[PDB]
Amino acid sequence: MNTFVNEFRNELETHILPFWAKLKDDENGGYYGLVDYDLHVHKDAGKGGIATCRQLWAFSAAYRVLKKEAYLQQANHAYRFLTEYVFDHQYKGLYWMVDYKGNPSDDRKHVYAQAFGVYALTEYYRVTQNQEALDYAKQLYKLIETVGFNEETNAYKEEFNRKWEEQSNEMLSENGVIADITMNTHLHVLEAYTNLYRVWEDEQLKGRIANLIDLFYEKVFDKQSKFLQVFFNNHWESIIDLKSYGHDIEASWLIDDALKVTGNNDRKYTQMVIDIAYNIEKKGVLKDGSLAYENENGKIDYTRVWWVQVEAMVGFYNAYEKTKDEKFLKAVERIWDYVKTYMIDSREGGEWYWSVEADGQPTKREIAGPWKCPYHNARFCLEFIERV
């Protein structure tokens, strides 16, 4: 197991983090906004608010665990861009997108983005004790708890305009009939708040975590199928037949972290964590050991998506810790083999591919951009390092 973890640490320190460091944008701040499949760096691309949070989180956590000062320097650079340009100093909260010079380009205010801000700012606080960073985190928490929370439905909200006026609060069109409530937003609020409580042990916050856990247990989690549901109406009724294998296994270990940080030993929640992990081991893993992406209606998308694989490795290893069931260890080993064989790019200039098709070929999608950054894959390496 030390063998496997040395391979993850090597991947992290010699491939992943150097690639992201090569995107440091000294002139304009933060990190260049796009690297396409063919490894062109678009220095003038838009810079995501969430991407910037994730960059800050990844470098801060890398520094916490591995303690190399270069990682702190990267974290500082991310912090500056986040607080100087991505934060809206007039109407407050994080922009969805800025242009390459940090001017607002998509000035919508999404609860999901505010959550990622809390998560990243608290992680930076863990390694700096920068009081400003923690205050910023508390401001975003305040927004999410007030304007970003629906008292009536017991649910966090979705999308606002710049001035915090509730918009088409959904998962952008596509739905056809739009969602009022999403699992995804609730997950990342829980993730963020877990990290906040590590740094600020507030009793009210504790209660907000317990509330999220109970929403997961009662509303999100199907106690028959053992899957999470994804999209809901305002009555917390699921509105689409969709299973997202990666979200489930991620949620398994993130909820567990929320349990651990707050001392919540309620047995139904522990059992939920375990049952999800068994469910995804049985239903999500393909015959090559990789994980499928989604099952919509009857139809499985067999694309191997990068973040799904690493969340499965973490969630399965957590499950192994709780069950001592070798099935989970075996699952972790086989995902890792798949990942080294098909998902980690061996091009000079490369990192990880976004996804791999069923034929084994890389999907021709960007390597870095608003929706692909170092958080998932760095976090995976760091979780194993710290757990072992």
PDB file of N, CA, C and O in Angstrom, residues 15 44 63 65 75 97 113 126 191 196 214 261 263 267 285 368:
ATOM      1  N   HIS A  15       4.358  15.312 -11.972  1.00  0.00           N
ATOM      2  CA  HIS A  15       3.591  15.453 -13.206  1.00  0.00           C
ATOM      3  C   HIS A  15       2.497  16.505 -12.992  1.00  0.00           C
ATOM      4  O   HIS A  15       2.477  17.510 -13.705  1.00  0.00           O
ATOM      5  N   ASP A  44      -5.037  34.304 -23.194  1.00  0.00           N
ATOM      6  CA  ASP A  44      -6.091  35.304 -23.164  1.00  0.00           C
ATOM      7  C   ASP A  44      -7.463  34.667 -22.891  1.00  0.00           C
ATOM      8  O   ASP A  44      -8.481  35.330 -23.026  1.00  0.00           O
ATOM      9  N   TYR A  63       0.610  22.128   0.040  1.00  0.00           N
ATOM     10  CA  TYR A  63       1.555  22.715   0.981  1.00  0.00           C
ATOM     11  C   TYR A  63       1.341  22.142   2.382  1.00  0.00           C
ATOM     12  O   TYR A  63       2.307  21.771   3.042  1.00  0.00           O
ATOM     13  N   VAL A  65       0.237  19.252   3.333  1.00  0.00           N
ATOM     14  CA  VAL A  65       0.575  17.853   3.456  1.00  0.00           C
ATOM     15  C   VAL A  65       2.051  17.664   3.152  1.00  0.00           C
ATOM     16  O   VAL A  65       2.710  16.893   3.845  1.00  0.00           O
ATOM     17  N   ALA A  75      -0.070  28.896  -4.038  1.00  0.00           N
ATOM     18  CA  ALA A  75      -1.291  29.199  -3.292  1.00  0.00           C
ATOM     19  C   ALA A  75      -1.480  30.707  -3.110  1.00  0.00           C
ATOM     20  O   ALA A  75      -2.584  31.233  -3.285  1.00  0.00           O
ATOM     21  N   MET A  97     -17.241  33.960 -13.977  1.00  0.00           N
ATOM     22  CA  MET A  97     -16.078  34.047 -14.848  1.00  0.00           C
ATOM     23  C   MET A  97     -15.529  35.473 -14.828  1.00  0.00           C
ATOM     24  O   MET A  97     -16.274  36.441 -14.655  1.00  0.00           O
ATOM     25  N   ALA A 113     -20.486  28.317  -6.659  1.00  0.00           N
ATOM     26  CA  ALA A 113     -19.221  29.022  -6.683  1.00  0.00           C
ATOM     27  C   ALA A 113     -18.877  29.573  -5.295  1.00  0.00           C
ATOM     28  O   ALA A 113     -17.710  29.531  -4.909  1.00  0.00           O
ATOM     29  N   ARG A 126      -5.841  27.346   6.678  1.00  0.00           N
ATOM     30  CA  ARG A 126      -5.195  26.275   7.425  1.00  0.00           C
ATOM     31  C   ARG A 126      -3.674  26.424   7.370  1.00  0.00           C
ATOM     32  O   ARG A 126      -3.003  26.111   8.347  1.00  0.00           O
ATOM     33  N   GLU A 191     -19.223  20.029   1.603  1.00  0.00           N
ATOM     34  CA  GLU A 191     -17.774  19.919   1.509  1.00  0.00           C
ATOM     35  C   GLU A 191     -17.128  21.184   2.083  1.00  0.00           C
ATOM     36  O   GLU A 191     -16.200  21.112   2.862  1.00  0.00           O
ATOM     37  N   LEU A 196     -14.747  24.588   6.770  1.00  0.00           N
ATOM     38  CA  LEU A 196     -14.914  25.799   7.564  1.00  0.00           C
ATOM     39  C   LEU A 196     -14.912  25.407   9.044  1.00  0.00           C
ATOM     40  O   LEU A 196     -14.254  26.050   9.864  1.00  0.00           O
ATOM     41  N   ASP A 214     -28.628  15.308   6.926  1.00  0.00           N
ATOM     42  CA  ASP A 214     -29.976  14.760   7.014  1.00  0.00           C
ATOM     43  C   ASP A 214     -30.724  14.910   5.693  1.00  0.00           C
ATOM     44  O   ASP A 214     -31.402  13.976   5.253  1.00  0.00           O
ATOM     45  N   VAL A 261     -15.608  15.180  11.284  1.00  0.00           N
ATOM     46  CA  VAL A 261     -15.246  16.517  11.752  1.00  0.00           C
ATOM     47  C   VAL A 261     -16.226  17.004  12.819  1.00  0.00           C
ATOM     48  O   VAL A 261     -15.854  17.742  13.727  1.00  0.00           O
ATOM     49  N   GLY A 263     -18.213  14.829  14.787  1.00  0.00           N
ATOM     50  CA  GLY A 263     -18.458  13.846  15.839  1.00  0.00           C
ATOM     51  C   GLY A 263     -19.857  13.240  15.755  1.00  0.00           C
ATOM     52  O   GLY A 263     -20.437  12.827  16.756  1.00  0.00           O
ATOM     53  N   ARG A 267     -26.033   6.208  13.324  1.00  0.00           N
ATOM     54  CA  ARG A 267     -25.697   4.973  12.648  1.00  0.00           C
ATOM     55  C   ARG A 267     -26.283   4.932  11.246  1.00  0.00           C
ATOM     56  O   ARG A 267     -25.736   4.260  10.385  1.00  0.00           O
ATOM     57  N   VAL A 285     -18.520  -0.030 -11.520  1.00  0.00           N
ATOM     58  CA  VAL A 285     -17.249  -0.534 -12.008  1.00  0.00           C
ATOM     59  C   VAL A 285     -17.449  -1.458 -13.214  1.00  0.00           C
ATOM     60  O   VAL A 285     -18.234  -2.401 -13.172  1.00  0.00           O
ATOM     61  N   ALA A 368      -7.058  21.688 -19.485  1.00  0.00           N
ATOM     62  CA  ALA A 368      -7.201  22.656 -18.428  1.00  0.00           C
ATOM     63  C   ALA A 368      -8.175  23.725 -18.896  1.00  0.00           C
ATOM     64  O   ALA A 368      -8.098  24.193 -20.038  1.00  0.00           O
TER      65      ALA A 368
END
